[PDB]
Amino acid sequence: MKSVVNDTDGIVRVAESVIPEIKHQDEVRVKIASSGLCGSDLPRIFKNGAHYYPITLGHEFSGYIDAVGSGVDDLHPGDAVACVPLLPCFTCPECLKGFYSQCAKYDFIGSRRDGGFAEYIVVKRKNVFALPTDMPIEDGAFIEPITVGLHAFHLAQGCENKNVIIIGAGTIGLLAIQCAVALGAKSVTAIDISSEKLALAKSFGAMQTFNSSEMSAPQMQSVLRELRFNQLILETAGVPQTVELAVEIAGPHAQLALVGTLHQDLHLTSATFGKILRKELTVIGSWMNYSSPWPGQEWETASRLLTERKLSLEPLIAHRGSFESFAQAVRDIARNAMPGKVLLIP
Amino acid sequence: MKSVVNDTDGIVRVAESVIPEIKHQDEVRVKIASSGLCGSDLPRIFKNGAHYYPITLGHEFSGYIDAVGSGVDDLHPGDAVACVPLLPCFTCPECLKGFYSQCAKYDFIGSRRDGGFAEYIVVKRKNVFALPTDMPIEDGAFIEPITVGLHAFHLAQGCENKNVIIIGAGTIGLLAIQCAVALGAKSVTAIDISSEKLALAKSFGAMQTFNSSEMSAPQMQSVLRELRFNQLILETAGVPQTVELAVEIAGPHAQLALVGTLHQDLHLTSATFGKILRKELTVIGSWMNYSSPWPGQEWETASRLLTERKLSLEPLIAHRGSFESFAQAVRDIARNAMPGKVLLIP
Ligand SMILES: [Zn+2]
Ligand SMILES: [Zn+2]
Ligand SMILES: [Zn+2]
Ligand SMILES: [Zn+2]
Ligand SMILES: [Zn+2]
Structure with a gap:
């Protein structure tokens, strides 16, 4: 064989x-x-x-x-x-x-x-x-x-009526968008480095998309203002820049689910770490x-x-x-x- | 005046x-x-x-x-x-x-x-x-x-019947020990560099203490084996070394409450970050x-x-x-x- x-x-x-x-x-x-x-x-x-x-x-x-x-x-x-x-x-x-x-x-x-x-x-x-x-x-x-994806949603006690944010538009992340829609998320937003797996993400039901190669964290946070509450963020890209991005863009008391494994060290500034405290985030290892x-x-x-x-x-x-x-x-x-x-x- | x-x-x-x-x-x-x-x-x-x-x-x-x-x-x-x-x-x-x-x-x-x-x-x-x-x-x-300390316990849905670990024996950490005992933690373990703050911790009810200037994370985890479930760890020292230590020593599905603000950047290795996922920790910003x-x-x-x-x-x-x-x-x-x-x- x-x-x-x-x-x-x-x-x-x-x-x-x-x-x-x-x-x-x-x-x-x-x-x-x-x-x-x-x-x-x-x-x-x-x-x-x-x-x-x-x-x-x-x-x-x-x-x-x-x-x-x-x-x-x-x-x-x-x-x-x-x-x-x-x-x-x-x-x-x-x-x-x-x-x-x-x-x-x-x-x-x-x-x-x-x-x-x-x-x-x-x-x-x-x-x-x-x-x-x-x-x-x-x-x-x-x-x-x-x-x-479903396991991370499970650990976060569901995505129902939540504003979900999927970072990373590889297969795992694109599937998570589709599941989030079907399990009754209030909204889904997709974020990635390249521009139109993001179009694909919109066809799967993401109501908006951020190209992180063209928008900074503050520009993303400004757009997310109306949706800053009851967030569930899945980090699926597994690179330190996206872990840092998730913390920076997160709204108050957001749940942040980590599913991407890192293969480089994570350096967080004192300021970024502080936002984990100040926003009272919940970071969920998955x-x-x-x-x-x-x-x-x-x-x-x-x-x-x-x-x-x-x-x-x-x-x-x-x-x-x-x-x-x-x-x-x-x-x-x-x-x-x-x-x-x-x-x-x- | x-x-x-x-x-x-x-x-x-x-x-x-x-x-x-x-x-x-x-x-x-x-x-x-x-x-x-x-x-x-x-x-x-x-x-x-x-x-x-x-x-x-x-x-x-x-x-x-x-x-x-x-x-x-x-x-x-x-x-x-x-x-x-x-x-x-x-x-x-x-x-x-x-x-x-x-x-x-x-x-x-x-x-x-x-x-x-x-x-x-x-x-x-x-x-x-x-x-x-x-x-x-x-x-x-x-x-x-x-x-x-009580706010961190609250975010974690209580310390009752939990194995709590307090890292940092400053006033806030020593008070969290006393509150943990009073609120019915299953056990309380204190961790610090001061053998004398650690004696005080025991007098407040900590059943054991680890001096981090003398013990390794693996050494600590080895001692913690029989108490590795239902952990609640409060990081009160607010220095990057103790945030790192909390992740390294934590047991499976431990809650990690972050109360200490950093004034220095945090550099986590890819292995240490990986443990957050592999252990399915819940990190709680307070x-x-x-x-x-x-x-x-x-x-x-x-x-x-x-x-x-x-x-x-x-x-x-x-x-x-x-x-x-x-x-x-x-x-x-x-x-x-x-x-x-x-x-x-x-
Ligand atoms: Zn796989
Ligand atoms: Zn106000
Ligand atoms: Zn104070
Ligand atoms: Zn087994
Ligand atoms: Zn560094």
């Missing part, structure tokens, strides 16, 4: 291996139909940021059950699934509290073990999420990234996308919103291709910005 | 001035009995951090009503009061929401206008808080710093100490805790004296750490 294998210093190749066998009663084998590249994969590919090399990535995928272990009774060959890539231990104090992403013994498909840029993969039953039979299988690759009961309401909500057509996935996709095509598309990214969702279609 | 006036390059003066007159129907004049130096006053004196010079500071004080304006019907000469130093406008959208410390137009006794390091002051009726008739008048000077109904339940709680003898103020006090000895005590601080509460007794 074919897979995409990444090696040290940004080398990407397509490799041939034997199909993995089911080795435990609670495992399943999935034949992968659609597998997306995450923003968080780019440092793994191009900045030696993976836990090991060589490695096969991919934690955003869907497929059909190919076989099941003898202990699996609720899934059958042919069933459509999405991958639930985190595997907590379920027995540490954190896990028994429902803090699965604070488990100090978890596995992660496409990060801590090999993942979904392959024709087949064997994973635990708890690592797959059943899809509605009428849902197009390709759509299932977006479930995991949808739940990223990690992964899970809650009890496993894998969490986020996952059922993601599937539900898709089926009732509240979400729009096609405009997000910058590329579909099989292995050679997808590999070169990944190579073409270089250390540049993500064009849109790059999908592997085996 | 005498007052303490500080000037540009850390000069502290005792000056003579005329007694201020009541000019509006809703004003009172207070003859000041006890007036304390806040940790936040030190950058105002020695790091040119005040809004203007020359200036008279002091926002932690108590006294007796000397005279009242013609429109004041519920206070009279001889009444004991504490100062409520913030004066919001009460007519902006922030104030109408009960967000008094975000008021666009607020005044502040001892920061935006001259304060209580004087024999008499004229302030609004809204700037004084009636004390119980049996309360020793000097105790009233501690009400404002008490409510600082500013001043007010709520609706003005000035807030915090002030009622402070008064009550004092009257039922749940707090201990005498060991906090490092100095008592009239104008000349108080001024020299202040000068002796220079650019060093606070010895304890320095009080002016006119």
Whole structure:
């Protein structure tokens, strides 16, 4: 079978291996139909940021059950699934509290073990999420990234009647705009460095957009005056300039949800830090996308919103291709910005 | 009348001035009995951090009503009061929401206008808080710093049954320890560089203490293992090293309340920032100490805790004296750490 294998210093190749066998009663084998590249994969590919090399990535995928272990009774060959890539231990104090992403013994498909840029993969039953039979299988690759946004909204106790601000218009951020609209946000505003993913964001329902390469924080705050109350800001870009921007533009008692991981240090001026105090902001760390009961309401909500057509996935996709095509598309990214969702279609 | 006036390059003066007159129907004049130096006053004196010079500071004080304006019907000469130093406008959208410390137009006794390091002051009726008739008048000077800690606890929805960690053993931190014990924290841990402030913390009820000049963050986290859940951490020291420490030591889903204002920039590593997300911390900006109904339940709680003898103020006090000895005590601080509460007794 074919897979995409990444090696040290940004080398990407397509490799041939034997199909993995089911080795435990609670495992399943999935034949992968659609597998997306995450923003968080780019440092793994191009900045030696993976836990090991060589490695096969991919934690955003869907497929059909190919076989099941003898202990699996609720899934059958042919069933459509999405991958639930985190595997907590379920027995540490954190896990028994429902803090699965604070488990100090978890596995992660496409990060801590090999993942979904392959024709087949064997994973635990708890690592797959059943899809509605009428849902197009390709759509299932977006479930995991949808739940990223939904988890942050969950931590903030909802976005209903809130003025939400999404910073970053990558796939995660564009999905968060669509979810915010569908979950009854009073308004949605999008902010990003380049100018018309912002047009795309307006088509998804953002009532206004700020190009941060052309507006300063004060200019943005001035426009936001009428909407300065009951704010929920999601920082999805994961660069220190946007974290700083969120604090600067925030209105009184705004909730600020951090979902983007930084790969450079954050220097905040004394003044900016002071605004966290003076505005009495609530800064909410957000990690992964899970809650009890496993894998969490986020996952059922993601599937539900898709089926009732509240979400729009096609405009997000910058590329579909099989292995050679997808590999070169990944190579073409270089250390540049993500064009849109790059999908592997085996 | 005498007052303490500080000037540009850390000069502290005792000056003579005329007694201020009541000019509006809703004003009172207070003859000041006890007036304390806040940790936040030190950058105002020695790091040119005040809004203007020359200036008279002091926002932690108590006294007796000397005279009242013609429109004041519920206070009279001889009444004991504490100062409520913030004066919001009460007519902006922030104030109408009960967000008094975000008021666009607020005044502040001892920061935006001259304060209580004087024999008499004229302030609004809204700037004084009636004390119980049996309360020793000097105790009233501690009400404002008490409510600082209580406001942070309030923002965090209480400290009851929580494992609280107080970082910084200045007067405000030591008071927050006593309040935490009184309000039923499951445990209280104190952290500071002074082994002696730490002994005091234990006598106030801290079950353990970490000296940060001698212990590492990992060393601290190791000790905190059995208490790592349901944490409430108050950062009161207001220096970048302790903000960094709070994030490093925090347990899973800990609340982190920020009450100390920085006067130096904050440089967080990408790893330290990452912990905010990975631990799913909630960072709570805390500013001043007010709520609706003005000035807030915090002030009622402070008064009550004092009257039922749940707090201990005498060991906090490092100095008592009239104008000349108080001024020299202040000068002796220079650019060093606070010895304890320095009080002016006119
Ligand atoms: Zn991802
Ligand atoms: Zn676990
Ligand atoms: Zn103060
Ligand atoms: Zn106001
Ligand atoms: Zn720096």
